[PDB]
Design a protein around this ligand. Structure first.
Ligand SMILES: N[C@@H](CCC(=O)N[C@@H](CS[C@H]1c2c(cc3ccc4cccc5ccc2c3c45)C(=O)C(=O)[C@@H]1O)C(=O)NCC(=O)O)C(=O)O
Ligand SMILES: N[C@@H](CCC(=O)N[C@@H](CS[C@H]1c2c(cc3ccc4cccc5ccc2c3c45)C(=O)C(=O)[C@@H]1O)C(=O)NCC(=O)O)C(=O)O
Lengths: 220, 220
């Protein structure tokens, strides 16, 4: 009974879910939306509560909304900490990471005349707001993981973000030693290493031609 | 030990938290950000993990990120369902609600040559996507509450959204009978009725002048 992930063949909002399942060591299948018809069929068949994907078929549910899916999976595979206090830290950290991830992913979609400004802003937020915040969390307790001295969903989310930060501008990570060491450690975990290796279901960034052609194949 | 809510004197992202606390019957205090200096002092004194509000002081923590705060309060006051399956539904419904709430609140902040288009879109999403989805949930089980036949955080989030929908265009709710009956019932709950009464900490929509004022008073 493998979860089925319904999304376009791209990172988008589904990648964080792919990462979480991979880290949990859970095998999943994907049903790619390749044409407006595919998407229309999902809607008509009553499979999308709000007519949007990501949508994940898991445990008899056709679950939509990225956060709801992530929350369910983290709880199911014990990657959501042990109590509500720990969950408050995990949630607070996760939301910050999701905010930056969105800001960065949004760049390739910015009108040409606005993209240089949006990019400088994203880089500024990365080095002056977000990375310092997490470097600080690690420094605060000197432990290997962000929360509870054990692996949780947020360690996975942070690793993922660091990869995107490295893609944006690798020099952004230079001033953060604790984060650099964290990146190396999480990357070495068996399930993670497996997802980072070539041939996995991990998705690449989309280039200009691809983004442009997909915006036209659908309605973006 | 009343929780302390730090935000501007307006709805913003803090209103959903005010509503959740009020529905739980939990008294809270508010410390309004009235000047850039107020905000700067919060940041400098180490109160905001990502230099942003909402921020809520509760149980020895200074919690930021709207969803992290809501999740903690829901769990603390037993408004988060009874298990992970129920939480998946609560989470999926809540995310759809936050999505529409954002879309609607964002309108007063859209340029004079967009509000027009943005507003038609929002109204369309409301009547053709979101209201139908929830009308359908209620129809599916004929129960008084959205999930588990008992009050949860999402019944509160839905009531709040319905109020905003009614402010946008009262005719939007007309084609949805189950939602109209739901709105009346929830509004009759003692804690809810109390917050709906004049003089409560419930905040009003901000007008054009007020928006422009703050827009210049701060970096908005
Ligand atoms: N709050 C929800 C949000 C879910 C959501 O937004 N889903 C969208 C995905 S399209 C998503 C989107 C946009 C532009 C593009 C542009 C190029 C592109 C190339 C390859 C893959 C995608 C994938 C998504 C996507 C886009 C691409 C832009 O329009 C937006 O940013 C959209 O959010 C969708 O299903 N749209 C169908 C429709 O409404 O009928 C969640 O967290 O799950
Ligand atoms: N993901 C986080 C997001 C939290 C967040 O965004 N906080 C902002 C609130 S300002 C918020 C915002 C904007 C415009 C306006 C414009 C008019 C206005 C009038 C009266 C009250 C507010 C309150 C908020 C606000 C704005 C107003 C627009 O810029 C944006 O929409 C902003 O998100 C903040 O603290 N900014 C300080 C700064 O970065 O240093 C969460 O969910 O908690």
């Amino acid at each position: 009974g493998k979860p089925v992930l319904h999304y376009f063949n791209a990172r988008g909002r589904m990648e964080c879910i792919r990462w979480l399942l991979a880290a949990a060591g859970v095998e999943f299948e994907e049903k790619f939306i390749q044409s407006p018809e595919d998407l229309e069929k999902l809607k008509k068949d009553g499979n999308l509560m709000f007519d949007q994907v990501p949508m994940v078929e898991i445990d008899g549910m056709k679950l939509v909304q990225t956060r709801a899916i992530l929350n369910y999976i983290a709880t199911k595979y014990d990657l959501y900490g042990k109590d509500m206090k720990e969950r408050a830290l995990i949630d607070m950290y996760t939301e910050g990471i999701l905010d930056l991830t969105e800001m960065i992913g949004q760049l390739v979609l910015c009108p040409p005349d606005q993209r240089e400004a949006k990019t400088a802003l994203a880089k500024d937020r990365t080095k002056n707001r977000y990375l310092p915040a997490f470097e600080k969390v690690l420094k605060s307790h000197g432990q290997d993981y962000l929360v509870g001295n054990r692996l949780t969903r947020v360690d996975v989310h942070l690793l993922e973000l660091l990869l995107y930060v490295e893609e944006l501008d690798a020099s952004l990570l230079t001033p953060f030693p604790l984060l650099k060491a964290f990146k190396s450690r999480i990357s070495s975990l068996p399930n993670v290493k497996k997802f980072l290796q070539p041939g996995s279901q991990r998705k690449p960034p989309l280039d200009a031609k691809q983004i442009e052609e997909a915006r036209k194949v659908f309605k973006f």
